[PDB]
Amino acid sequence: MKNRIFVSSSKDFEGYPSKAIVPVQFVALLTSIHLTETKCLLGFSNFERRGDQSQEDQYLIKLKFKDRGSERLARITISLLCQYFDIELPDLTVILRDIHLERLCFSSCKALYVSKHGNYTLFLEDIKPLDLVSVISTISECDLNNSLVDIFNNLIEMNRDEKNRFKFVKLIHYDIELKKFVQDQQKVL
Amino acid sequence: MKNRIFVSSSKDFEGYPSKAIVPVQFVALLTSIHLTETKCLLGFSNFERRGDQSQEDQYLIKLKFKDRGSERLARITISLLCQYFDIELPDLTVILRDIHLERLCFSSCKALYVSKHGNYTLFLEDIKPLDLVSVISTISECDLNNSLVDIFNNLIEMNRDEKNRFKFVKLIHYDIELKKFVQDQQKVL
């Protein structure tokens, strides 16, 4: 249950137990939301540049529900999670993809890694949204801080690369401090 | 299910069906949070000044859960709901009372009124937190807007009244625009 392990990369998992319950915690950008009748998937990524050719949703957190009761709470959580970050939700399924193309949505997640027969799934225990300004400040253990530096380094990797769809200059936010922080210590080193 | 009724006052309910399901919606300040093993109660109020002698939690919304599964979502919702408003939550029960004494937490709620044998309970369908600055702007149908005017009028009622514990000058927020908006059109009329 509760003596938690930091995860710097979803690749760590392929080296994990194979039959256990490991309380985990990672830092990533919320990149996708899917609420269906059956389930609700939250996709996160730090954009490690695997090869690529795919980084978008490298952590997929499962919000399992069974009834009218629990789906309410699922929707309320999604609603509150989008509101925090400024994401337009419907009124009263949700398909949201490549959220990072419009909005840098840094999140700090506590989840439960459960494995059975080599296979594993992550169950959400907590998501702590981080404000971009609070993130930028935080770059001016340091596991969280190192992951954020990593993630922003990877976001400069993707932006100057004229092939990938993500552009800083194409974000919605959009704080004048962003252009500064990007041009600053990061995309000069 | 879904053709919703605005509620200006929790007193409206005593005049409701007695055996029905009425989709409702009200605007109030979040004033209390209680997450237990069994349940989770969200207390809201507009502070109508009944007599008084009690306004604190005149709307009590029920977040019913049954299992390990649904309690997670309950906690995540509470966590996300407190984060939005800037409320210090533990790490990983929650008792929070008279939240309005520290923080004006305007919320717009959609709930389900269900009655059986004269008795009724409210089930949360959605909570939309409102930013104080967005609330203050909104006072510079208008059901929502009228409720907010009402609620602020009642907050001036409570503050200048040197008996009640709520004081504007004792809030945490705390934006310099608040002192202005209070001293302005409201506490001059």
Domain CATH for B30: 2.40.50.800
Residues A130 and A175 in one domain: no
Which chain A residues in 125-164 lie under 8 Å from chain B, judged by CB atoms?
A: 125-129
Residues A93 and A163 in one domain: no
Domain hosting residue B163, numbered range? 141-189
Q: Does B80 touch chain A (CB under 8 A)?
A: yes
Which amino acid would we find at residue B139?
I
Q: Are the C-beta atoms of residues A118 and A142 closer than 8 Å to each other?
A: no
Residues A91 and A129 in one domain: yes
Residues A118 and A161 in one domain: no
Residues B21 and B74 in one domain: yes
Tokens found for residue B157: 């009622």
Q: Are the C-beta atoms of residues B99 and B31 closer than 8 Å to each other?
A: yes
Q: Are the C-beta atoms of residues B124 and B111 closer than 8 Å to each other?
A: yes
- DSSP code at position A3: S
- CB pair distance less than 8 Å for A63 and B73: yes
Residues B130 and B103 in one domain: yes
The Cα-based distances of A17 to A3, A12, A22, A24 in angstroms read 15, 11, 9, 13
Q: Which residue of B has its CA nearest to A130?
A: B83
Degrees to nearest 5, angle at CA A41 with B69 and B79: 55
Residues B129 and B47 in one domain: yes
Which amino acid would we find at residue B12?
D
Tally of structural domains, chain B: 2
Residues B170 and B187 in one domain: yes
The runs of H, that is alpha helices, within chain A are 68-85, 132-137, 143-160, 176-183
Q: Does A68 touch chain B (CB under 8 A)?
A: no
Q: In sequence order, what E strands does A36-105 have?
A: 40-45, 59-62, 94-96
Which chain A residues in 96-115 lie under 8 Å from chain B, judged by CB atoms?
A: 110
CATH number at residue B170: 1.10.10.2380
Q: Helices A68-85 and B68-85 sit at what angle, rounded to 10 degrees?
A: 30
Nearest-angstrom CA–CA distance, B125 and B133: 25
Of A64, A69, A128, the CB nearest to B66: A69
- CB pair distance less than 8 Å for A84 and B80: yes
For chain A, state the CA radius of gyration.
17
Chain B residues in contact with A73 (beta carbon < 8 A): 63, 65, 70, 73-74, 77
Tokens found for residue B155: 């907050």
Residues A102 and A173 in one domain: no
The Cα-based distances of B100 to A87, A89, B87, B121, B133 in angstroms read 27, 28, 11, 23, 16
Resolution in A: 2.7
φ, ψ (nearest 5 deg) of residue A108? -110, 110
Residue A120, class by beta-carbon neighbours within 10 Å (0-12 exposed, 13-18 middle, 19+ buried)? middle
For chain B, state the CA radius of gyration.
17
The residues that bridge with A110 in the sheet, in sequence order, are: A25, A126
Residues B131 and B149 in one domain: no
Of B140, B162, B178, which closes a domain? B140
Nearest-angstrom CA–CA distance, A105 and A176: 17
What method did the depositors use to determine the structure? Answer: X-ray
Residues A136 and A153 in one domain: no
Q: SS3 string of A132-180? A: HHHHHHCCCCCHHHHHHHHHHHHHHHHHHCCCCCCCHHHCCCCCHHHHH
The residues that bridge with A169 in the sheet, in sequence order, are: none
Residues B41 and B75 in one domain: yes
CB under 8 Å to B101, separation ≥6 — which residues?
B165, B166, B170, B171
* Nearest CA-CA partner of A61 in A24, A16, A99: A24
Nearest-angstrom CA–CA distance, A33 and B95: 31
